[PDB]
Amino acid sequence: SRHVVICGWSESTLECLRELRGSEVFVLAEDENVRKKVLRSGANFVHGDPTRVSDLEKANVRGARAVIVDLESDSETIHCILGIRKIDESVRIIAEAERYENIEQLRMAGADQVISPFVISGRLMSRSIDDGYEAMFVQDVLAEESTRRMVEVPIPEGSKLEGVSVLDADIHDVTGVIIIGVGRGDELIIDPPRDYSFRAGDIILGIGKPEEIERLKNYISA
Amino acid sequence: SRHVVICGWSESTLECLRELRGSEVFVLAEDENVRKKVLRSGANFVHGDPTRVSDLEKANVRGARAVIVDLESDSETIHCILGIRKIDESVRIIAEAERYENIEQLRMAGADQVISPFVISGRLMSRSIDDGYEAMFVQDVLAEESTRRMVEVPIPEGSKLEGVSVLDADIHDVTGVIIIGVGRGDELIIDPPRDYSFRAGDIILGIGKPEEIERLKNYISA
Amino acid sequence: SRHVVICGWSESTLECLRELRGSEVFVLAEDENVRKKVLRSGANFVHGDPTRVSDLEKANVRGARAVIVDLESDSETIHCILGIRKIDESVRIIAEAERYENIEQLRMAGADQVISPFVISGRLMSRSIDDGYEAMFVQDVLAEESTRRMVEVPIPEGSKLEGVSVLDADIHDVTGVIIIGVGRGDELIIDPPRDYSFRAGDIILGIGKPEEIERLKNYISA
Amino acid sequence: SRHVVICGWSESTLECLRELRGSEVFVLAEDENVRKKVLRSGANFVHGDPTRVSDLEKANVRGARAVIVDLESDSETIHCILGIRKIDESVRIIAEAERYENIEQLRMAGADQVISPFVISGRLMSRSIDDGYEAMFVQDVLAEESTRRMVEVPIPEGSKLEGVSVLDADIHDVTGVIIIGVGRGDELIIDPPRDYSFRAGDIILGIGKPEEIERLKNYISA
Amino acid sequence: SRHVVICGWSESTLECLRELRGSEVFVLAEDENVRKKVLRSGANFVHGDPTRVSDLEKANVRGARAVIVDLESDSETIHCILGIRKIDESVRIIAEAERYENIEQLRMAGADQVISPFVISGRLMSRSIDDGYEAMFVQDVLAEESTRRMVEVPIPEGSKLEGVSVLDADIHDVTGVIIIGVGRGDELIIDPPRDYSFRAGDIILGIGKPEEIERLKNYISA
Amino acid sequence: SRHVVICGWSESTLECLRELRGSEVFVLAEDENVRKKVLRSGANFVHGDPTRVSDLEKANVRGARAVIVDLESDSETIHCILGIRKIDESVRIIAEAERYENIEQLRMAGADQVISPFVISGRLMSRSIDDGYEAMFVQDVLAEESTRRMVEVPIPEGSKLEGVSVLDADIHDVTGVIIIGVGRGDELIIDPPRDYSFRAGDIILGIGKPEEIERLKNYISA
Amino acid sequence: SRHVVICGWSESTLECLRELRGSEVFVLAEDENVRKKVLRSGANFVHGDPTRVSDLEKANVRGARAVIVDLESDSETIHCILGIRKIDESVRIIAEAERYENIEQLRMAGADQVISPFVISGRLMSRSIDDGYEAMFVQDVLAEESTRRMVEVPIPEGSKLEGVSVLDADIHDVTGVIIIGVGRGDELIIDPPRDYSFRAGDIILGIGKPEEIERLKNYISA
Amino acid sequence: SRHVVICGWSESTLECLRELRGSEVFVLAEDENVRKKVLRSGANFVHGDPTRVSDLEKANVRGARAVIVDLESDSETIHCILGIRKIDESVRIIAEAERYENIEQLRMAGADQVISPFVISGRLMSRSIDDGYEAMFVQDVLAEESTRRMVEVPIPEGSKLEGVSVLDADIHDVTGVIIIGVGRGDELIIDPPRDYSFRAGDIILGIGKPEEIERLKNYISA
Ligand SMILES: [Ca+2]
Ligand SMILES: [Ca+2]
Ligand SMILES: [Ca+2]
Ligand SMILES: [Ca+2]
Ligand SMILES: [Ca+2]
Ligand SMILES: [Ca+2]
Ligand SMILES: [Ca+2]
Ligand SMILES: [Ca+2]
Ligand SMILES: [Ca+2]
Ligand SMILES: [Ca+2]
Ligand SMILES: [Ca+2]
Ligand SMILES: [Ca+2]
Ligand SMILES: [Ca+2]
Ligand SMILES: [Ca+2]
Ligand SMILES: [Ca+2]
Ligand SMILES: [Ca+2]
Ligand SMILES: [Ca+2]
Ligand SMILES: [Ca+2]
Ligand SMILES: [Ca+2]
Ligand SMILES: [Ca+2]
Ligand SMILES: [Ca+2]
Ligand SMILES: [Ca+2]
Ligand SMILES: [Ca+2]
Ligand SMILES: [Ca+2]
């Protein structure tokens, strides 16, 4: 597919570059001494300032399919998002929020999805006082080393499940995939009710072993 | 319950102190210029160095029920964890990893739950290039304002589900919650197979509306 | 009159606080080492982070008649303007642009007047290679010590100059005030054409000696 | 004509190098990582220390027609001005003042014109509290995009205007330009009184449309 | 035997590398400007970070017979000890403590022996106020130049000394060595009482002339 | 007794001030940020530069019974010893060597006892590769908490052991004190030969339990 | 006489303040921790910044008879010299040059005597490789404790040497001093030729015992 | 001749290296980034620590004809002088004193000549208050650009002046050289008395023009 631009170099973008092996990744950062670690991670390095529109352009923000923005502070992230939305109004921007108060300003500035690692970490630290099964669940289903994988299985056009409710479908009973939520557009319904009718173009968010994912994919086929 | 000691002050401890309303919190940090934001958040401030054992015994580590260690570096976090393990060996420690490679070191040092926010943030960044329902699910089920709540419902002794298999139970059709994992002790089995059988002391990790949570709590009772 | 809030401490805010003798000024800055030099100039100091919304609500942004934003970078200035515009949708914001590319973004964020000192400095530097009369003019008319003064005289409702053109009024021969512009709302017409007709509510931007300014104010009266 | 030397690199010199396109410009600065920016702005780069006389002689200060000094502080600017005056006592130096109190010392060191941007910025931010017509006037007549330009015409020898007063000449009623100042040598008389008689050699500072500029040039001919 | 790894470089490791001549020594340190000193002291140099598990595995920690950790602080030393214990749980670690209070935490992290030089230095400087015979004793029996050496002999299996008390054995009157301690495993009994019976496996710590050392070795034979 | 002067503040001087409870200690150091930690240990602080002779005369070097010199480098230690020896030619100086090459220069400059902690640390590091009984012995006998104590017992004038050899005296069987050396003046004979005869004025350096030390003091009395 | 102001504090100002006993000295420096050593040396301390004009007028630059400028860098020295020349244009400035190339800049800035100690020290170092009588002469004639004194004996009006040539005078055989130079105004003629003739106002620079100085003062009198 | 070793890099050694052009000069310093300026000054660079005896030796201190020692502080200079006197007891050491109190310790440590630039500068600054002819004299006769040169002219064996007094010689009357002093061994007599008898092996210290130096050299010949 098309290339991916990463604005800023930190630990979040380091793990994102670890899971994005194979694709074309350009890294735009100010430090000249991070070129060796960007190239050892298998990505191209572009020396520049990510808040400038000229240097933003140099990294080919127009032709990218997603831009990942993680700079030093929230103000620089909002400024870089405003620059990218000045250049291209249709590209996908994924941003990282350091404070909880700035998620609304990051969404109004033009980010297509805002991720808050300190809010997630604070909620997991507050929830792991009694016993930490939520943090174990999150950190184990995000890893590509366990047996159960959380995948998005799209509903094709003309499928066998067009218009059927969740109760009559029985996806967990046949396929063995735990259906934790179903998504439409930019919205997600976690634990969907029983009178929810499936529509064409939906995204099923599920957890299961890979042969269960194959049986689910063969079950919802055209 | 007892009180909670927090070593270090950051954004993660801000969100943890937000969701810790109703308890007694002692914050131990070296900066004196965080006393105003600690005392506004409903916590006591104890000035000292968290890596030092006398300043740890100032903050009542012994009578605590959990200690949260979020310091600046992983070296300081390991040093503070060993300082806590000097004083009380059986207290619960929830640590935070800055880098991914130090998770095994933080577990060998004595932490009971290691929460790495940047690995979670990078994995939610790279899984949102196409569509971001996974990041929305993760950030939605942890917030205590939405409709669906991720809870831990323990199976009591003398239950009607003791020895009953999960295929014989079929909890989602009767009660309406999604049994996404069953844990006992330190281990968590995500998406358990149908030949798993419950016992007394197992913890059920599930997602549902609070009416469904009350139906599940009344379903597993004697 | 109401008070003025100044975000950030720099040289521009120092000169602005010099020319603001008589008013009530609140200064919101992050450094505590500037408390003496803020208090020496006749302004009350408010310690806080100006890009944070709570520290903006500390300094009474709502009851202010103008907010002067001049922080260390353009990203922080855009973030502070967004934070003020979250609070008061109708307050007047005067901002300072560090780059020429950011003037339109500081205006889209919500500033009413964006003043770029580096662009004016570069354009007065390049216009001084032969003979610097432009820089001498600009730096002489703004100083409140010289003989000629650049003022704004509004046209009262019911003035004798209603409907009169700038050719038929002949302001320079009667009063002595050099008419370099006529303003209406957020628009200024420098060197207005002779067919431009005056209306009540207009602002006349002119240069003249103070006796000539008083003769102009007596001339355009009802 | 000859070349222009620029000692230092900042936003002021960047906008000055924007306005000085087509000419031959040498930029002398310490950082070698600005060479690509100096070349992309159309200027030759000379690596060295601006306060040192050897690197000043490397950058061809002797044959220059103007040197523009904009360094990090006022001590380095004064040191550079004294070095240039050691090399060439007759070249023109345009200096930039960081602080307001160092202007007379920069003039004593040898600068032919001192442009203080933060003083202008503070005075415009102070005058823009009520309504900002002064900042609009300055940033509109300096920007080479709008219709009215602030230009200078010299009075040639034996002109029709030699020895006539401004009340007898009546420049604005015939030509259409607004006479804001007329200056001789290194002085400037803003808003000259009616008894001021013109002499050959004076430079007329005016504002008008370009057709009025050509009419003014055709009127003041010999 | 095998090789010896040294993590860090200081005066302690320099004198240790002086005493460890003839063996095979790898030195792992961050500065690349110590390579000539490591090679001139007769040891191979490995460039890298001692707290990182990758650079620890680069320096052959697995096949080592002892690793000596002497880093800049106690946090880095504890981090390095935990990294080595992640690689090899059975190798011997000799650590150095900077501060006195971190000794038990360095022992908890995994060090087989902690040598605190500044505690010994402070106690010798405190004991040397009246007359300094203790510092003379320590710095004379450790220095391999004087006549009396502090050596260890092991008691072989089935010896003539197996099961006899020290009052019955009378080592100093026959052999001429001064028995200052006899230790088993990881303990040491300095000045053992008369009812202490020897057993096969104990190590006898003594001070004497080398002819007395050979007489002691010939006396305790099987 | 008189007072003790300590030049420089470090870890060695901190432990020396720990073991000096009861005496009058003056600490001469250059940093003012150590005043609390000097005063907390029971020592009066004197701010000054220890390598300067006037600040040495401030802290009453002449009336002191010992001066402990431990500065940041060996050059400053040699300079401080020269400055003290300018003032008092007969005071006792205890110095700390950072390098092995500088012990003879610190002794030629005028120190009475030079204690090198890094050489002892390196020699105990290299003697712990197999089994560390030497380091355990050295760090156990110097601590004033353990069971056995390394003491100095002087021979009074007119003692019963005058003229008696170390073989005929038989100190270990009568008293229990392990005789590891006999000192006379600035000389120590570790493991003295059996033909060595005692004289009045000798110092016996021994190890033993405190009851055995009192039995030795009763045995060698007149 | 009048008072002397000293800008900056270093070792040169220490020796200058030692030889300035009997006068009134005001020391102006930014550090507050030099007040004790300034007040011990018989001088007044004025806290302030020597490059600032208000802190210069605090230290009474106007009524002074000489100002000594020895700051940290040559940029700061030039800035302070121009600050002094703002206030009193005719006062005597004795400056100090850190580097050799800034001597012409320090003279152009307004200093009346520039003293470069490192050029003198390097020239006395390189002229002492064979034998060092030149360094001994330079360091001996400046010390006011030796036998021979370098003085300035002015020739009064109405003298017996007015118009008399130096060959006709032959001052060394009559009075005993060595006439090593005769200066008038700013110029100094070292080793004058025999056709030089004296005038009224010439200063004789000579070396001799104070008896010979009194004989020279009585020889040139009327 | 033989080579010259310079310990440390500063401005004094820079001017010393400027006047020592042609000879073999080795520069021993710790900074690795001064190699380019040492090589551009025409001298060989040796990377090392000048206070270490091993690195001192590497620079071939034994075969040198003079060592010039100018380090950061006086303690390092005394330490390097003690190291050089440990290596070679006959080489010539020229040292630089930063404080006046340490000249005696630098001479006792083994320096053959000690130069104090701050004492010279303080005495010249104190002597230049009235008018600065002493500083002009010193700084002009040390320079190799004026007409008068201060040279050392040795007295040969069997000369015409063996045994003659200063009065009968009349060196200034014949040769024109001002004889300011005569030196023997390590002593200098400035302004020698009239009954001083010349001896073979003396050094005459004189000022004059070069043809006067030639006439003096021909006058005192064998
Ligand atoms: Ca981040
Ligand atoms: Ca839980
Ligand atoms: Ca399943
Ligand atoms: Ca953190
Ligand atoms: Ca996805
Ligand atoms: Ca449900
Ligand atoms: Ca600004
Ligand atoms: Ca112009
Ligand atoms: Ca007028
Ligand atoms: Ca600038
Ligand atoms: Ca206005
Ligand atoms: Ca016009
Ligand atoms: Ca160490
Ligand atoms: Ca003792
Ligand atoms: Ca023996
Ligand atoms: Ca030390
Ligand atoms: Ca051993
Ligand atoms: Ca015993
Ligand atoms: Ca200086
Ligand atoms: Ca010489
Ligand atoms: Ca004489
Ligand atoms: Ca020096
Ligand atoms: Ca004088
Ligand atoms: Ca002559």
UniProtKB/Swiss-Prot annotation, chains A, B, C, D, E, F, G, H:
Keywords of the record: Calcium, Cell membrane, Ion channel, Ion transport, Membrane, Metal-binding, Potassium, Potassium transport, Transmembrane, Transmembrane helix, Transport
Domain RCK C-terminal span(s) in chain numbering: 138-222
UniProt membrane topology term: Multi-pass membrane protein
MF terms in GO: identical protein binding; metal ion binding; monoatomic cation transmembrane transporter activity
Compartments reported by the entry: Cell membrane
GO BP annotations listed: potassium ion transport
Coiled-coil region: none
Domain of life: Archaea
Residues that, per the record, bind Ca(2+): 70, 96, 98
Main subcellular location: membrane
GO cellular component terms attached to this protein's record: plasma membrane
Domain RCK N-terminal: 1-116
Subunit description: Homotetramer.
Domains: entry comment: The channel is composed of 4 repeated units, each containing a transmembrane pore part and a gating ring part. The gating ring is composed of eight identical RCK (Regulators of K conductance) domains, in an alternating arrangement of one domain from each of the four subunits and four from the intracellular solution. Two protein interfaces between dimers of RCK domains from the pore-forming subunit and from the intracellular solution hold the ring together. One is called the fixed interface and the other the flexible interface. The flexible interface forms a cleft where calcium binds.
Further facts: It is not known whether calcium is the physiological ligand.
Role of this protein: Calcium-gated potassium channel.
The protein's name in its UniProt record: Calcium-gated potassium channel MthK
Organism: Methanothermobacter thermautotrophicus (strain ATCC 29096 / DSM 1053 / JCM 10044 / NBRC 100330 / Delta H)
Gene that encodes it: mthK
Shown residues in whole-protein numbering: 115 to 336 of 336
